[PDB]
Design a protein around this ligand. Structure first.
Ligand SMILES: CC[n+]1c(-c2ccccc2)c2cc(N)ccc2c2ccc(N)cc21
Lengths: 186, 186
């Protein structure tokens, strides 16, 4: 595809190399297009990036839906969502590229611009879970927005910063996490 | 000393221009040494950075050892240590050199022998906190090593991924976390 097949390119240059570890010229290579095709939908490096981000976060949010089904109590949705967060091939596989981006481009309205849209969807699944937790009364939080951002990131840390130790060790830890967190709420 | 001098010039160069752009030639010139004497001491840029990384980790351990008398109980140190991490990393100079490096040497097994031992150093502080909390009966945790691991990375995510918010709110979520998390141990 025109400006669509190009999108799947950078995605890999970012997951395979990082943000400034991949450039337009680069893209253009396996891309095979002109530095104007990008002009249209992709105004700047940031855009292309901030764009691919959300896209992927969505394939994730989508898989999450087509999967939570195997969880009864919301509390199970919690443990699960975090667990799955570990195995997906979506979004998280370029959270380091984002760590960089957070620096290389923070003297510029993008963080809260389009990147604020992501910040929302990124903590949505948690928001539901927690919110619907008050209903089912599995617990009860008086600031669901705070706890939601909290959970989201911590979990994201457990996923990002431990990508070295074997995959099964990881799954165990994350579960010992959810136990503690959920238990710290009620 | 000529070693320290290298380490001294090297650090600022990295702080002034990131990890990637800083060349050893620069380091040797401004340190007034020789690639020879340099190579003898560190063998590589990658390796040089690591040693600075370690020297820094030891300076951290220092601050923590002094700045922690302001926290009587282990339950308070956990609160203090966490806040401390957020604030200091808000304006940590090398912060950008670090991110470049972790992205510049992810899969590299070798650079990961020390890479981990160092990381392991930050996890110790928590480990210490939790064990002491044990001996005192502030809580009860047997798999200290697991919690310590979870607390380190959970916090890191809270600190790293929350960059879009004002330092007042951040310190708020972080203290909220510390309370919630710490609340799932008794
Ligand atoms: C947890 C290790 N760790 C730290 C770190 C955290 C606390 C103290 C010292 C270093 C880190 C710190 C910054 N700024 C940026 C990236 C990373 C990172 C990236 C990947 C990884 N696999 C472990 C990582």
């Amino acid at each position: 595809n025109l400006k669509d097949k190009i999108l799947g390119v950078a995605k890999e240059l970012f997951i395979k190399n990082g943000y400034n570890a991949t450039t337009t010229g680069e893209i253009v290579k396996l891309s095979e297009s002109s530095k104007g095709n990008l002009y249209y939908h992709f105004k700047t490096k940031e855009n292309l990036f901030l764009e691919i981000l959300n896209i992927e976060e969505s394939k994730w949010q989508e898989q999450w839906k087509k999967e939570q089904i195997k969880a009864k109590t919301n509390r199970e949705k919690f443990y699960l969502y975090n667990e799955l967060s570990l195995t997906t091939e979506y979004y998280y596989p370029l959270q380091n590229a984002i760590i960089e981006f957070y620096t290389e481009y923070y003297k510029t309205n993008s963080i809260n611009e389009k990147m604020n849209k992501l910040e929302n969807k990124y903590i949505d699944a948690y928001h539901v879970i927690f919110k619907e937790g008050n209903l089912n009364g599995e617990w009860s939080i008086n600031d669901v927005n705070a706890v939601s951002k909290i959970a989201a990131n911590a979990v994201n840390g457990i996923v990002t910063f431990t990508h070295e130790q074997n995959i099964n060790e990881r799954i165990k830890l994350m579960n010992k996490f959810s136990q503690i967190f959920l238990n710290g709420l009620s």
